[PDB]
Amino acid sequence: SSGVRLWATRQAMLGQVHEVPEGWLIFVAEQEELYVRVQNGFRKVQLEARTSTIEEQAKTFLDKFNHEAEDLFYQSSLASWNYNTNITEENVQNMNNAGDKWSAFLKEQSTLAQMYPLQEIQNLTVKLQLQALQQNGSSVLSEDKSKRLNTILNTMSTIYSTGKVCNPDNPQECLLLEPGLNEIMANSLDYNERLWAWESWRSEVGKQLRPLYEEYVVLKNEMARANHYEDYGDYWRGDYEVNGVDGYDYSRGQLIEDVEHTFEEIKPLYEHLHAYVRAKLMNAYPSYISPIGCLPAHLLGDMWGRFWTNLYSLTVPFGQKPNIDVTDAMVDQAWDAQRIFKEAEKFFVSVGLPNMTQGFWENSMLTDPGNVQKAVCHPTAWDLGKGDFRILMCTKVTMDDFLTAHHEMGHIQYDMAYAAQPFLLRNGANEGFHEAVGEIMSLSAATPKHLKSIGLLSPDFQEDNETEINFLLKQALTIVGTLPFTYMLEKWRWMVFKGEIPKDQWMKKWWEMKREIVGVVEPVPHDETYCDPASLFHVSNDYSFIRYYTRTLYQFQFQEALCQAAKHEGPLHKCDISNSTEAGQKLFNMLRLGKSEPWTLALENVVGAKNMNVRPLLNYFEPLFTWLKDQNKNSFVGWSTDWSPYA
Amino acid sequence: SSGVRLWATRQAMLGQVHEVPEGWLIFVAEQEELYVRVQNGFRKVQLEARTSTIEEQAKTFLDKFNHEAEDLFYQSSLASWNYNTNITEENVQNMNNAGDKWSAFLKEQSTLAQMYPLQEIQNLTVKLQLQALQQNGSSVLSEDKSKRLNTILNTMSTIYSTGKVCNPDNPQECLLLEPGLNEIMANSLDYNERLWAWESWRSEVGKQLRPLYEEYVVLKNEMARANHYEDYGDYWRGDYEVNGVDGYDYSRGQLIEDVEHTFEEIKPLYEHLHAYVRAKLMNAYPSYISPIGCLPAHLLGDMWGRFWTNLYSLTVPFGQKPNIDVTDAMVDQAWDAQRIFKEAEKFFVSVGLPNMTQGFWENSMLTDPGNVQKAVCHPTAWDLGKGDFRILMCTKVTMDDFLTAHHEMGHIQYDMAYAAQPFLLRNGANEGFHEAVGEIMSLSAATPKHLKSIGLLSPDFQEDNETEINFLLKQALTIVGTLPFTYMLEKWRWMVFKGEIPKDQWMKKWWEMKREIVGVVEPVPHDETYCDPASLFHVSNDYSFIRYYTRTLYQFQFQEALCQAAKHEGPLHKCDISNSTEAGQKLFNMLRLGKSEPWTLALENVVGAKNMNVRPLLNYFEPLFTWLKDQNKNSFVGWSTDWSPYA
Amino acid sequence: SSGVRLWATRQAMLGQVHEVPEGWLIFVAEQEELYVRVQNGFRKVQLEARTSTIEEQAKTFLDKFNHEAEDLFYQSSLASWNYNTNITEENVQNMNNAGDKWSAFLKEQSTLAQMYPLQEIQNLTVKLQLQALQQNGSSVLSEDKSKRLNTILNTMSTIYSTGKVCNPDNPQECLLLEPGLNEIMANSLDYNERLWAWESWRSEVGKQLRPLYEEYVVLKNEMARANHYEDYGDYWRGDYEVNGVDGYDYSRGQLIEDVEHTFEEIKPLYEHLHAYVRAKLMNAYPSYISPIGCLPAHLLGDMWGRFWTNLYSLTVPFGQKPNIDVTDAMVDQAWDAQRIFKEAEKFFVSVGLPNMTQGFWENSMLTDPGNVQKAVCHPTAWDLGKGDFRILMCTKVTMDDFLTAHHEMGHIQYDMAYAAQPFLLRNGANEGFHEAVGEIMSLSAATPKHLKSIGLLSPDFQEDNETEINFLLKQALTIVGTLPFTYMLEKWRWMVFKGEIPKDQWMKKWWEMKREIVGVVEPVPHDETYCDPASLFHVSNDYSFIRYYTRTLYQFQFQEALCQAAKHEGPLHKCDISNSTEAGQKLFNMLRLGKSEPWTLALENVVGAKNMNVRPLLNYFEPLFTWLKDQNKNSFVGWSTDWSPYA
């Protein structure tokens, strides 16, 4: 013993001096002060002034790769932005060529990185970067298995994107999922029209995708075994996995544990929320919604019941008190996309974050990019590299565009935060961190205190409890509404990749937890021909939906840390972090690392805990929970799986 | 590789450097010097210039307690001292009121100290001080149990004090134990007179204290059992218990066997001593002590048979030969108690111990201040605190009081010696150290060498073996004689606390142990109605009687070590530590430590033996041991338990 | 937090410097230097000039021994040198008298060493010294057992030296082993005379040697068993044993494994070598040796078959191609013995090794000093100690003596290299390391480039490939041919010491391995009455013979390492080390270690491998192996044990 016992600050040393054993060096990492642990305290130690292995070759190989990678990635990034801004055939070709150049280049380095054995490589950053490169992808399988898996992904993504259903009343009248079916599942309130749209989408897509999905899963599973995973779920569980880090290693199975462990705390709030929606639905559809039965899968505000936000019309806590809107004030104050972005930039400056790049304005587009060029209006950030930061969207004078602008800007702030890190580390620690950071900025941007501070919300405006309940429930519909849907679906892919559910029970098991975990009942029964669990975008397009679940746990914890940092006074849903420079600095310390460090370390450095939890959400919706329990003390609370609209 | 080991002191590492492997850095916590262990020596590495937790709160909690504890204890000691030296109603009020507030102060800080656990404390001193504070004692039980236990002790204290037995000849003529009954069996040699007083007290006290003793023992055990002890004997055995110290841990059960083992090897010396007393008692009581039977209880020169000092008149080795006493020379030089205490002060400066403050002398009652105010003449020490010291003794100009002055001042020097220790640690290592220090110096003072040096004894005094045996036997009767009685009484009390001796067999086993361990048999058959063991002041008032046996073992070890350090030659009873400055410095090494260190470490450093032993006892009385065998060859050696004066 | 990392040796530091993080202070005990670790390298920190127990007693006792031992050994060496240079009765006594006094000094020092145990020494060098002196060896037995070993050892030595066999035709014509019997089997090619010489020697001398060798074997086993060995074979294996060194321990049992493992790898080379010699023996003895059976024992060029170079007259690959001979140039250039050593001195200077000092020329004779005083013409290297190194040889103007002087020069330079060690540690690592140094110097002196550089080889000479084959086969007969003989003899001597085979099969086992391991069958069967295993000098003189097998393994490894530094291109046997200073410095570092450091580390330092390996042996004779396989593909390869000339 009597070795190196080093920590960050002297305050840690004062609290841990009794912990440090006799003879152990007390080195303060931040203060660069060295002390020796002696009898009842520490003594000052004299310090002087600050001054071919394969691992050395790997460092040369890795850095050399970066310079090539930076250039080629920029070409692919630019080709994408040009194609995204203007969808033309020429824009496609360069995107293909740059992507083909980029993809081919990466595998050569991937194979070359695999030539380096990581066991003899001890640098934490270097070893992580190499394995981040040594990943061979689908090439770990055979080419034909890679060919099948990729082509199916091309087809499955195409089928979901091109999934179009036709009503039996008119064969020629066919409506896509968007905007045809989704508007019907959200805006239309007809029992049959929503039932048909829900049924037809899962019929013409699920039946076609089910054979493709069956082969897709095993292809994804066998590569996971080829990549040393129990299933492709564990392959996606390796994304949050932390290995080799003392005090921060995160096992893949722990991801399943934490998601289920945190989900059980959401059930009581959700159950009363589920009962209240059932209580409100039975006020609108008493026949279609039983007081004890589950909520029909076609009356949930969207195709799959993913979000209950569109049910706010039928489940409004207080019709006389609408949600706080300052979009008209923006119209009154003549605010527009550049103004909103400038206000967002000012808000980011308000929390101490640096002002965003001016080159963004020259390069990125905010409003609708006309019609000659073809572009997507969805909020999309663009960290093209080499200091090139952009956001591609059509921003109008609306809160949603205002909030998503904050959501997208936070990504860019995160993008430049880890831009100092190498290209391999130039990304978020996990898939949900950047999105979670984007959300909390929008949430703070949506705070009425911020709106009142900036003048969007008038000073004489009052935030009554009914409005807060209206706000919280709308938050619950958006956030807590999708949590059970996210929890089961990701867990569904977990067991499907693990093969727990046999082919002849994928649909039956889906409806088993639909009515039980989520309390959602299919209006008409579906069999294994249907592939409704894969009918969503992420499952069809092979995206781990856990990102939404993880970020929601992260964002509330981060916001809770923000509220603690900003010293919020009031309801947690009213927590505004405006004019809180220190919180941005603390957030910057997390964001500056990006993915250079384990996400558990970053999570603890912000919220104080190395594990995600839903404790802020319970605090966030605590007044709402009491109101929901008060509203549900009369109506039945829970859900009966046996009941169904078809029986 | 290599390791670094730190030393508190440079000299400890210098003597522990050869076994250190080469390459280990040599660092000392005091000199802060850098050395590297190299081949056959060490190279001095050049060094540059010098550049919450419960335990820290625990350290601060103790220090604040020490300030108020030192103040209130000083007032309590002062108030009690006034009552002793001046026995008046108001002085009694001061002694009671100050003690009550001190008692109230002790429990309040003890309760507050309970919120400072001992396990997380790294400092043994900090943990030990709180452990003394956190000792709930009788309060671990319910409040009624403590009150009734004190009620028994109050009744035990009053009854023992007021125990008066009336002579059958005159019912009005009644005598208390002190000084009436004690003088009967110490001065009067009439067997019947001693027998009546011995039986009357044990009958009167026994019939009223036996039922109280049964309950008092149970109450003492129950709190000990709740205080994690097997019995109240183990509760008292925790005084010598050592825990948490490497190389010096002492267990409570180790105390039992050490006292037993030490006494067993004393028996061959004691059996000859018992035989000679038995042989000499026949010369005065031919029909009352058998040549093989055990000694009569009241024929031992004292009340309980504890001290055989008065038997020296009847069992003198050579009555014609004089005894070591310069009491006449004390008054031939026109001295007094003040000069006697001055000689006691001269004794400490002769052995090298520093002189004490004059404040002690001006506050100490060395002689009774007349008769208008009553001064308690019971020898005691007063470590009042804040450097205040007093001696409660009506010392006169006599050799007997000359040793008493040395004995009491020995406690005072010891009490001030560990003043550097905290108030909780301002005490002796155990209950047999301060008495040991004062006894050995008095014995050294009583030697002819000390008396001749200061002119108390003429140099023409004949230091022949005739006076050597007479002095040894008188010391043996006082010191060696009380060891068998002290050992059994604590052993008997231990089994009563442990419940081993049946309640209907306490009296028989007490005398059976007296018959066997001590070779002393009661003159009248006492049943369990009697409470002869509790007739002692210590047993009734709940005083651990093992302190005297340990003190006797410690003092001889202390004395022999001083004589060995002073290069004493010849019989050990003539050893004088006067004019030996090294002996006091050697003695003072433990005296400053006090009770912070284990007593085993204290005993080993002073003497050389970690545990107790009887080797100094054999060295002190070796001429007597051979002399006893010469006188005891004509009579039985040992004792016979069956014989009794009543049968 | 960097801290300090310490290495005892540079090799440990360099081998571990890669894993040292930047900024770590690095200290090397051997170099007494400070280093600061940086990226992909280390930076040295400059320094100024260097600044009771049994361990202390042992160092003093050993240090005083070395100086005294050097003198007495030098006196014994001085007298022995005079005895060998001058064969006179006076010189015989001086060698014995100085030797006896020196031997008595070792015995006295050994007695004083036995009280200094090795385990209590914290200095590795000090512990090793007493180990080599505390070895009682033959003295662990009784005086009579030691006495009876000495007489038989000399008796079997004298009988071997005075092996007298007389021709049956002429009783008075008796030829001794040297030069009579040896020349018969070396120069004379008559099968019958060699058959008689081999048979008569092993018959008359074998009968006399057998009781002496068997008794000597048992006694050598008895002492070794009492010396903590399984047998006397293990006693000799203890010289090569290394224990207690991390990464360098060598066990005695592994020596048996390594010898057997290496010999199996040499079998493919030897089977073709045996086949070709068998093919060539048929060209001269078609009626005695078959193409399938083994070889006659006397048809190996010697009675024991140790040296097969005498067969080169009948087994030459090409009788017309000249070998590497420069004796003509030596005579033409008027060279003598002094020029040979001077040319050896020039070669050693060119390679960087130090030149021979003044004491060599002034004290060491180089030619036989006429008939006035007889000089032992056997070439011996005389390390008399205390700066006295001498070479004894009857060197003539010949190429053979030119190599032999280099052989003695290698030993002399080997001896002086480890002079920095104490006298006890001033010895070779084992019994095969030192002999390897001499042979390679002769091999280096035999290289064509060295002769050409010094003018011995005419530059106009053409080095044909066939000449290389003849050179390699001639070298193979001397060295590669002797490997099977050394393996079986040591394996047989392992059995006789360990007693794995009863005495009635010792000779049967000796020829069994001759038929199988060596592929050589005795022309006349021999029973246990003979002592053919002891017919060699070392077996008949209590000398291990495995030292030469280790010598062969070490010398080629040494030869490979020297060419590795020289970076020679082409055949290994054509490599030269002239004008290669870096090779000599590394070689001298190998020679300066002596026995103070493990030979496994020394073998690692020179080459890189800590275990035995036969790659240099195959590399040196790589053209020879292909030539033998090409020539022996038309003939039977291997041997048949059953076949015999007498059967």
Residue numbers in the entry:
A (entry chain E), B (entry chain A), C (entry chain C): 1 to 51, 1019 to 1614
What does the paper behind this entry write?
We describe the development of a biologic that takes advantage of the proximity of the N-terminus of bound ACE2 to the three-fold symmetry axis of the spike protein to create an ultrapotent, trivalent ACE2 entry antagonist. Therefore, we sought trimeric scaffolds to fuse three ACE2 moieties and leverage the inherent symmetry of the spike trimer to maximize avidity. Thus, we determined a trimeric antagonist fused to the N-terminus of ACE2 would require a short peptide linker and would be less likely to form inter-spike interactions. The collagen VIII trimerization domain is significantly larger than the collagen XVIII domain (44.7 kDa and 19.3 kDa, respectively), but more importantly, previous studies reported that collagen VIII melts at ~45 °C66, whereas the collagen XVIII domain melts at ~85 °C (vide infra). Given these observations, the smaller, more thermally stable collagen XVIII trimerization domain was advanced to develop the trimeric antagonist.
To simplify the nomenclature, we refer to these constructs as TXA, where ‘T’ indicates the collagen XVIII trimerization domain, ‘X’ refers to the number of residues in the linker, and ‘A’ refers to ACE2. Next, we turned to cryo-EM single-particle analysis with trimeric antagonists bound to SARS-CoV-2 spike trimer to validate the design. Starting with the 3-amino acid linker construct (T3A), we observed electron density for the spike protein, each of the three ACE2 moieties, and collagen XVIII trimerization domain of the T3A. The electron density between the trimerization domain and ACE2 moieties was discontinuous, reflective of the flexibility of the 3-amino acid linker. Moreover, modeling of the trimerization domain presents the “axis” as slightly ‘tilted’ (nonparallel) with respect to the C3 symmetry axis of the spike protein. We then attempted to evaluate the ‘symmetry of interaction’ between our ACE2 constructs with spike protein (T0A-S, T3A-S, T5A-S, and T18A-S; where S is the SARS-CoV-2 spike HexaPro protein) by likening the C3 symmetry to an equilateral triangle with all sides being equal length and a corresponding standard deviation between these lengths of zero (s.d. = 0). Thus, we calculated lengths (distances) and corresponding standard deviations between the Cα atoms of equivalent residues in the RBDs of the spike protein (residue D428; as determined by Fan et al.) and in each of the ACE2 domains (residue N137; arbitrarily determined residue on ACE2) (red and black dashed lines, respectively). The calculated mean distances and s.d. between spike RBD were: 41 ± 3.6 Å for T0A-S; 40 ± 1.0 Å for T3A-S; 40 ± 1.0 Å for T5A-S; and 42 ± 3.2 Å for T18A-S. Equating lower s.d. values to symmetry, we determine T3A and T5A to have higher symmetry than T0A or T18A.
